[PDB]
Design a binder for this molecule. Structure first.
Ligand code: CDL
Ligand code: CDL
Ligand code: 3PE
Ligand code: 3PE
Ligand code: 3PE
Ligand code: EHZ
Lengths: 178, 75, 94, 110, 158, 71, 84, 65, 120, 166, 458
């Protein structure tokens, strides 16, 4: 979720991302562990061979027939973890992730308690406004010299400057609000 | 490590009820005291026969006393 | 792999997230605030009874039952009659 | 109502005790790690499978033999009985995978 | 209409090729990907005909600006995004081919329905004669007329 | 929280070992087998048999029955 | 208990010390899997997967094509579950 | 409160084991007690008649002709 | 689910009787004299014991007994056990009564078929 | 035997008592999970009293508590039947409910809104029992639709998750 | 009934004469009491309806409404204190007076004995409404919406004018009392078959029928909240009240001249209900919900069975209150969001906890949850429709399933799901917003306790 999506996918990342779906869809078929760990080091073998094929055409012909072998030999109910897509606990504790710009409309009574909390909050909001200028300028001075732009954003590159467009990767509602 | 739990401001959705649950309860209880004490001490009437020429007034045909107070005084 | 710069952005922004979560921590004092069983079983009960024995009971067809399933040879309290017994079937053979 | 309520809260116990794992595939050997729920689970499982002299047995076999004795669809009569064997099967599936197997839960145990 | 010029809002079917490339700018698309909905005069206009794929299979990990619509800010919205939202229709590849699904499901349904029919034809009934109720099949108690006696229905031993 | 010495875990003595030996027959080394060892390593090492679960507590249950039957 | 970093740190270190290819007496945080521990890219898929099964969550593909220092794994895991 | 354990068999409290064996043992005492006192799980207690041993006199099968 | 179904559906037919219309031959197809069944309980006894219409069988009389001993003996629901055996038995004795009637109708229909070939 | 009628009316009043406590400001001061668990416990005992009665002699009581509309020929009234189906089920349901609320307190511990969750569970029980003991079918409808809506509110407890909403 | 009316007129002097700062409270506080005087009409201890005087009468059908018409003026003036609080102090006093005249006129129309008094007052209500929609309407299209609202009603209105003058010549007085106790039986000619259409069509237009309902979606979209409340709660029901009092005459023809409308309405109920299912503008969806739930009413005021009419009276008062509640909360989202789009603003319960409870109860009123007058109403129209033809349940059965779906979808995509990331931060709820709602639902709870009062004439 953190890093940005690459435009096109390489050959490798397509092969190496099957090694994951495949092995992980082999642990739904092999419910036990010793059977699995066995039937899987046999999987690597399949990927281990045909590793050094230099003939791209061939390589993309082993890959295209691997992902069809896989599609027809996949488990309907695989083991997808909780907190991962589709499976449970994915958006469970999102009802309790309020977006933090809401503590700004609190009644002076409510914010009266919880006093030091807002003393540190006002510091961070000073940090945010104190750098928007140096940030956006950075974002721009370092802008692409071509139309080729990826969603990757730059680091800080100077002391005191806060690595940019950061207010929402930091200050993110905590995962488990509980 | 108690942690601060951000929450929507909850005074505006609570100041409301202390005011709605209050000004209903303001005029509500004196009513409830009124319906109960009347219904207790004064009581609904018991039905009877028109006594040969009483020609009962409009209020006389209703059971509950305050329900025939309004009738006698206003209708 | 990690682009050199990408690992300085995640380097730095993680450093800030760690401070935000520290700041989220509440200071001591942070929250500055400025048998009964019979109670809700008996008190509710008296009322109900008041209602069931002096409104329902009083009004017509508000609490209706079935019969008492009288059996042969058992007496009827209200009238005094004694239900006639059955015949003497001697089948046995259980 | 009694036994199904038990099995679901039994799994409530397993799911909450484990790190919210709701899949039989990663849950194993609860019988030794948590005998209290496993004992409750098998009591419930046998009641679901109509073990003799348990709450399911008093009502369930009355229904079964009712079928075996009434005039009924032949297809309905055959499916209801194998449905009863299937109830034992999936009941077996739960205890074997959830309780009697080497543990496959995540490594830290709490 | 805060900041929206007619030319920043949709328009008519792009007739000439320069117009098809002008619209593609409006909609923040690539000029070779703007494929106007077919011109049959049902109103679509210049709205792009985006792939009919539901938000369900939009990468579920990427930080979509609008998280729940799994749609970014600016990307052309689909005409029927009121139907392909995650809470509604799905078009997400299925391990079993769709035809195979439709045939199998309905086959099952039919075989069952049929077998149930084979059943009604050939029922299962124990070797037991009919149950015998006393009096005249409880004529009076089944609520029968007290005055009119029924043709006696008698049941004999063995 | 202290953690058990990584060394403690070993594949012999567990079902992973037999998987290890047949994999070795093919020439594969079964690299992550050691990680999957604590599953079978100890405490959870004993095989669990289906009668054992169904019959848990039967021993005292019958002991209780006999006594009650006596009285 | 909640996951303290110095623990998560040890846990990721530990599992690797159980992978046969990775020397148990050298794996040192900051020892890049591939250019130091000299592990195949195919391996790193697995090393990550072990971690996904030690800590019970999925390191997304794009964010996991880069978990190569044996430490990135220790802050990424921690940053994910919000461990300060 | 208990302590998290890593790759080890979670320690068990006295009560956890005793209550578990208690509920299961009562299940077995009840099954055994009822089986002894009321064994009508098998046979009920009424035997099926062999419908094919009823003398033709019993059913009113007239002497053919 | 007996073999009776096999005999009728599969293989032979017109012999195994039809479930419906089981009583189909004269009440006396060679039955010399048969006293009609006897009902112990008075139509009223039942109506006063509020027996469900269905439960008003020829065993209604042993039922009323059970129900008697179940209202009496109230706190003890495990002591009206002899009464239940009796009712059940009465129910079996008629369960077999029904079994015997069905077998008799079977055999009689066979008589017809046997007599049929005497014909020609 | 008023003891019977009053008991059937009383279970509803006792279970409704947690609902209005949350309506007033009082629940903040006492513990809602413990209080609700106790009252269902007392409701089960109250349910037992009619159950024993029915066993003594089989009597069925139709209780017409309130009239709602004359509506000319079709009068509408609030009626609770106490036939074998209704009281047997009422006792079984509350026992299960008494079990679950105690389970709920352990299961949803750390949920920031435990009290609302317990509140809806009892509202579900009130609709479910109304569905059970309903003489006229209009009340049966109130129960039939009523459990449907609160199931909607409770299946999707965690509204954020779209899967729960779907 | 001149206390429900004269004191009302005097409101106008008070909105004008009063201080700019105190104008709002004098008007809202006083009309709350004006509603209290309105409650006196409910004291009917006898069947004989109340003929206050020659021109002014109140029978069971009008009384439940006159009280609602008086009740909403307070609420309308409380829902429009925000927008309309940016005005010049003479634009306000015009808006307040406009709202005041609507109920003065509407109170009289619902409380009028002479049918043409209904017509003059009936078609006058357009003047105040068109001003409220066109002058203060936010969108560029209100000029258009105003045109649609004036012409559809006006083209229907002149036929009724000719018809009522026609019956006055045929019978000799348009007095609803007499017309009822006199023999006016149409003769199924081709001409009468036109009279009937002339009288019903004007009423059928403002009661959106499937054929002519396009005016209502367009009008409520750009109309200010007070205008949308008035159109849904009182304005549309003017058409229903008219159909009940006008079909006393034209007694024989509707037996066979109704089929066209009945089928138009029941099929219309399904399609109007369904398009609610995918409409991006929330105010748009509530408006079509209003068309469908009003299509049921024209299908009960035409079957003409006692229960229908009773179902109609129940549903009209109930749906009036519910619709406003929905239009009022839609506005509260619109003012903070600044857009009518349903897709934006997701997750509000996370940030506006209570408004969501009001949203939930409003939706449950919208769909037929059973201990609500809304359900009693539909249950009754459903029954009679079934009596008309058992097949009707199929069409009145697809509507119930669809009505459940769109009512909950409004709750599911507006008040649940993950919060919108950062729309202009949504300021907390005012107490006015919440009361304006509470004032709508507390009466819905109280009326459901004793449905007899809104039970109709039948
Ligand atoms: C030891 C303790 C023992 C206690 C014993 C009892 C002591 C006692 O109080 O004496 C009884 C004595 C009254 O009894 P009584 O004198 O013997 O006789 C009373 C009269 O017969 C009758 O007098 P009344 O009717 O004038 O007074 C009572 C009346 C007073 O009425 C009012 O209060 C009017 C409203 C005032 C609002 C104020 C704000 O209350 C009601 O009418 C309640 C009506 C129903 C309300 C609940 C809603 C029911 C319908 C639910 C809707 C859904 C239905 C679905 C149906 C579906 C079917 C398919 O004192 C009272 O209880 C008075 C009660 C007043 C209650 C006012 C507040 C109500 C809210
Ligand atoms: C037969 C009868 C029908 C049976 C079947 C009925 C249909 C099925 C049930 C539908 C329930 C719909 C629903 O979800 O409502 C829940 C909704 C509460 O939801 P929530 O998510 O907890 O609210 C969170 C908000 O932040 C607000 O919560 P909070 O965090 O501010 O907590 C403080 C508390 C503070 O609660 C208050 O709102 C106090 C209001 C006091 C008003 C009266 C003051 C005293 C007047 C004296 C005269 O607020 C609440 O929790 C309740 C919010 C109530 C909103 C406005 C309710 C107006 C009255 C509703 C009456 C319903 C019918 C009578 C019962 O309101 C109810 O509890 C309605 C209960 C309805 C019971 C119906 C009858 C049950 C069986 C008899
Ligand atoms: C469902 C919503 C709640 C239903 C409440 C039903 C009772 C409403 C009622 O009218 O109670 C007060 C009643 C008024 O008197 P009235 O009805 O005229 O009866 C006169 C009899 N001669 O009678 C009285 O005023 C006398 C005083 C009664 C005070 C205690 C009343 C307690 C009633 C508890 C009934 C509970 C019924 C079950 C509720 C189920 C809720 C789901
Ligand atoms: C365009 C909208 C109007 C279309 C037609 C509307 C319906 C007919 C006109 C209005 C209603 C009406 O009153 O028509 C009835 C009238 C005959 O009146 P009737 O009472 O039948 O008199 C019979 C005497 N033996 O018969 C007529 O008035 C016929 C009118 C024909 C012209 C209609 C308007 C055309 C406008 C252009
Ligand atoms: C009038 C025409 C329409 C006008 C609309 C706008 C009017 C606004 C200004 C006026 C507001 C007040 C006047 C309208 C409310 C009238 C209330 C009322 O009439 O209560 C009557 C009731 C006595 O009951 P009664 O019907 O006389 O007895 C039946 C005997 N067979 O007396 C009582 O019992 C009072 C009880 C108070 C609290 C009752 C709460 C009960 C809630 C039950 C339902 C709960 C679930 C509802 C679900 C709804 C879902 C949307
Ligand atoms: C459980 C489901 C079973 C599904 C199993 C599946 O169908 C069978 C299968 O995967 S069949 C594997 C064969 N798949 C290849 O043969 C691709 C080879 N691809 C290359 O060799 C590349 O060209 C490269 C040189 C970059 C590799 O380098 P790298 O180390 O991967 O980075």
């Amino acid at each position: 979720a953190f890093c940005a999506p690459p435009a096109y996918l390489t050959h490798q990342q397509k092969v190496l991302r099957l090694y994951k779906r495949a092995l992980r869809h082999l642990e739904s078929w092999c419910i036990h562990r010793d059977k699995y760990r066995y039937f899987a080091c046999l999987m690597r073998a399949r990927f281990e061979e045909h590793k050094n094929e230099k003939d791209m055409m061939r390589a993309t012909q082993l890959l295209r027939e691997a992902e069809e072998e896989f599609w027809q030999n996949q488990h309907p109910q695989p083991y997808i973890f909780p907190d991962s897509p589709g499976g449970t606990s994915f958006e469970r504790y999102e009802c309790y992730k309020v977006p933090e710009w809401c503590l700004d409309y609190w009644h002076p009574s409510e914010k009266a308690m919880y006093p030091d909390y807002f003393s540190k909050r006002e510091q961070w909001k000073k940090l945010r406004m104190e750098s928007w200028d140096r940030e956006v300028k950075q974002l721009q001075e370092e802008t692409s010299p071509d139309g080729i732009m990826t969603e990757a954003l730059p680091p800080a590159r100077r002391e005191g400057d806060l690595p940019p467009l950061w207010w929402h990767i930091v200050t993110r509602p905590r995962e488990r609000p509980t | 490590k108690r942690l601060f739990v951000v929450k929507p401001s909850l005074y505006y959705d609570a100041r409301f009820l202390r005011l709605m649950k209050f000004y209903l309860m303001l005029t509500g209880i004196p009513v409830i005291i009124g319906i109960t004490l009347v219904n207790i001490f004064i009581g609904e009437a018991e039905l009877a026969e028109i006594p040969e020429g009483y020609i009962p007034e409009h209020w006389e045909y209703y059971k509950h006393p305050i329900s025939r107070w309004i009738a006698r005084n206003f209708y | 792999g990690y682009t050199p710069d990408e690992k300085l952005r995640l380097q730095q922004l993680r450093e800030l997230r760690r401070r935000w979560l520290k700041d989220q921590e509440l200071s001591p004092r942070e929250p500055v605030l400025p048998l009964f069983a019979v109670s809700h079983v008996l008190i509710p009960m008296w009322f109900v009874h008041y209602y069931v024995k002096y409104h329902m009971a009083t009004k017509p067809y508000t609490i209706v039952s079935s019969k008492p399933r009288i059996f042969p040879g058992d007496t009827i309290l209200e009238t005094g009659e004694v239900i006639p017994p059955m015949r003497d079937f001697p089948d046995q053979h259980h | 109502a009694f036994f199904k309520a038990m099995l679901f809260m039994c799994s409530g116990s397993i799911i909450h005790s484990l790190a919210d794992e709701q899949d039989i595939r990663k849950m194993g050997n609860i019988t030794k790690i948590m005998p209290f729920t496993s004992s409750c689970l098998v009591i419930g499982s046998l009641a679901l499978t109509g073990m003799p002299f348990l709450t399911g047995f008093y009502s369930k076999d009355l229904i079964i033999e009712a079928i075996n004795t009434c005039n009924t669809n032949a297809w309905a009569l055959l499916i209801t009985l194998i449905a009863t064997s299937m109830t034992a099967m999936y009941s077996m599936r739960i205890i074997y995978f959830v309780t009697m197997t080497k543990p496959r839960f995540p490594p830290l145990i709490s | 209409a805060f900041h929206m010029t007619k030319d920043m809002l949709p328009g008519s079917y792009p007739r000439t090729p320069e117009e098809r490339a002008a619209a593609a700018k409006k909609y923040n698309m690539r000029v070779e990907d703007y494929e106007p909905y077919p011109d049959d005069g049902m109103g679509y206009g210049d709205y792009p005909m985006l792939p009919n794929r539901s938000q369900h299979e939009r990468d579920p990990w990427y930080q979509w600006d609008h998280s729940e619509l799994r749609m970014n800010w600016g990307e052309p919205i689909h005409w029927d995004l009121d139907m392909y939202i995650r809470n509604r229709v799905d078009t997400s590849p299925t391990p079993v081919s769709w035809d195979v699904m439709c045939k199998h499901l309905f086959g099952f349904v039919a075989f069952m329905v049929f077998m149930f029919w084979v059943g009604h034809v050939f029922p299962s009934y124990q070797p037991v004669g009919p149950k015998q109720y006393p009096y005249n099949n409880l004529y009076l108690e089944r609520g029968g007329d007290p005055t009119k006696e029924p043709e006696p229905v008698v049941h004999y031993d063995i | 929280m202290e953690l058990p010495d990584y060394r403690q875990w070993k594949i012999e003595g567990t079902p992973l070992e037999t998987v290890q030996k047949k994999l070795a027959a093919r020439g594969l080394r079964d690299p992550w087998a050691r990680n999957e060892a604590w599953r079978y390593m100890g405490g959870f090492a004993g095989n669990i048999t289906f009668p054992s679960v169904i019959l848990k507590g039967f021993k005292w249950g019958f002991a209780a029955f006999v006594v009650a039957l006596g009285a | 208990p909640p996951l303290t970093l110095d623990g998560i740190k040890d846990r990721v270190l530990y599992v690797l010390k159980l992978y046969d290819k990775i020397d148990p007496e050298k794996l040192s945080v900051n020892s890049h899997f591939m250019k130091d521990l000299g592990l195949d890219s195919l391996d790193q898929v697995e090393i990550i997967m072990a971690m996904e099964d030690e800590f019970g969550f999925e390191i997304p593909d794009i964010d996991a094509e880069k978990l190569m220092c044996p430490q990135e794994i220790v802050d990424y895991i921690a940053d994910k579950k919000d461990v300060y | 409160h208990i302590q998290p354990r890593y790759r080890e068999f979670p320690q068990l409290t006295r009560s956890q084991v005793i209550q578990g064996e208690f509920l299961s043992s009562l299940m077995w005492f009840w099954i055994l007690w009822r089986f002894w006192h009321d064994s009508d799980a098998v046979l009920g207690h009424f035997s099926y008649p062999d419908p094919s041993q009823w003398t033709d006199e019993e059913l009113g099968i007239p002497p053919d002709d | 689910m007996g073999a009776h179904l096999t005999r009728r559906y599969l293989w032979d037919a017109s012999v195994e009787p039809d479930p419906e219309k089981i009583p189909s031959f004269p009440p006396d197809l060679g039955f010399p004299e048969r006293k009609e069944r006897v009902m112990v309980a008075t139509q009223q006894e039942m109506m006063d014991a509020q027996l469900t219409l269905q439960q008003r069988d020829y065993c209604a009389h042993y039922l009323i007994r059970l129900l008697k001993c179940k209202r009496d003996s109230f706190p003890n629901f495990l002591a009206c056990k002899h009464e239940q055996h009796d009712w059940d038995y009465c129910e079996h004795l008629d369960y077999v009564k029904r079994m015997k009637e069905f077998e008799r109708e079977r055999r009689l229909l066979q008589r017809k078929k046997r007599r049929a070939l005497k014909e020609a | 035997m008023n003891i019977f009628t009053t008991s059937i009316l009383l279970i509803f009043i006792l279970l409704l008592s947690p609902i209005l406590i949350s309506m007033s400001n009082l629940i903040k001061h006492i513990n809602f999970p413990l209080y609700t668990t106790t009252s269902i416990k007392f409701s089960f005992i109250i349910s037992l009293l009619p159950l024993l009665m029915f066993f003594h002699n089989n009597m069925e009581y139709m209780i017409t508590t309130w009239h709602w509309v004359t509506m000319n020929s079709m009068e509408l009234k609030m009626s609770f039947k106490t036939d074998f189906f209704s009281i047997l089920f009422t006792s079984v349901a509350l026992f299960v409910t008494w079990s679950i609320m105690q389970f709920s307190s352990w299961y949803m511990h750390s949920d920031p809104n435990i009290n609302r969750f317990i509140k809806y569970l009892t509202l579900f029980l009130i609709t479910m029992l109304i569905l059970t003991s309903a003489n006229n079918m209009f009340q049966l409808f109130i129960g039939w639709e009523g459990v449907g809506i609160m199931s909607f509110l409770l299946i999707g407890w965690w509204y954020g998750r779209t899967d729960a909403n779907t | 009934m001149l206390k429900i009316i004269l004191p009302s007129l005097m409101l106008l002097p008070l909105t004008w004469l009063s201080s700019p700062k105190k104008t709002w409270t004098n008007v809202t506080s006083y009309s709350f009491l004006i509603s209290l005087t309105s409650l006196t009409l409910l004291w009917q201890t006898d069947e004989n309806y109340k003929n206050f005087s020659n021109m002014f009468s109140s029978d069971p059908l009008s009384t439940p409404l006159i009280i609602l018409t008086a009740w909403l003026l307070p609420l309308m003036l409380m829902a429009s204190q925000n927008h309309l609080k940016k005005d010049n102090n003479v634009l306000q006093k015009l808006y307040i007076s406009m709202l005041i005249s609507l109920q003065i006129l509407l109170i009289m129309t619902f409380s009028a004995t002479e049918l043409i008094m209904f017509y003059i007052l009936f078609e006058a209500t357009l003047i105040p409404t068109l001003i409220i929609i066109t002058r203060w309407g936010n969108q560029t299209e209100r000029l258009n919406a105003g045109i649609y609202f004036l012409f559809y009603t006006l083209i229907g209105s002149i036929p009724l004018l000719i018809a009522l003058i026609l019956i006055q010549n045929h019978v000799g007085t348009l007095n609803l009392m007499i017309l009822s106790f006199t023999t006016h039986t149409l003769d199924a000619s081709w001409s009468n078959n036109l009279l009937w259409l002339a009288c019903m069509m004007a009423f059928l237009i403002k009661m959106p029928l499937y054929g002519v309902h396009l005016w209502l979606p367009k009008a409520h979209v750009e109309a200010p909240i007070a205008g949308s409340m008035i159109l849904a709660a009182i304005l549309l029901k003017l058409g229903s009240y008219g159909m009940i009092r006008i079909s006393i005459i034209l007694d024989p023809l509707t037996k066979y001249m109704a089929y066209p409308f009945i089928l138009l309405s029941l099929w219309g109920m399904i399609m109007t209900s369904s398009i609610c299912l995918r409409q991006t503008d929330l105010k748009s969806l509530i408006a079509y919900s209003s068309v469908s739930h009003m299509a049921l009413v024209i299908a009960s005021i035409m079957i003409q069975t006692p229960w229908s009419f009773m179902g109609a009276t129940m549903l009209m008062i109930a749906h009036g209150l519910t619709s406003s509640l929905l239009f009022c909360l839609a506005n509260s989202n619109y003012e903070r969001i600044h857009s009518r789009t349903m897709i934006m603003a997701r997750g509000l319960q996370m940030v506006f906890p209570l408004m969501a409870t009001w949203w939930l109860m409003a939706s449950l009123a919208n769909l037929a949850l059973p201990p609500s007058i809304n359900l009693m109403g539909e249950l009754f129209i459903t029954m009679s429709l079934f009596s008309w033809s058992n097949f009707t349940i199929i069409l009145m059965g697809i509507n119930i399933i669809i009505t459940g779906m769109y009512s909950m979808y409004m709750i599911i995509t507006t008040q649940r799901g993950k919060l919108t990331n950062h729309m202009i931060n949504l300021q907390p709820s005012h107490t006015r917003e919440l009361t304006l709602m509470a004032l709508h639902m507390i009466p819905l709870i109280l009326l459901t306790t004793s449905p007899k009062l809104i039970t109709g004439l039948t």
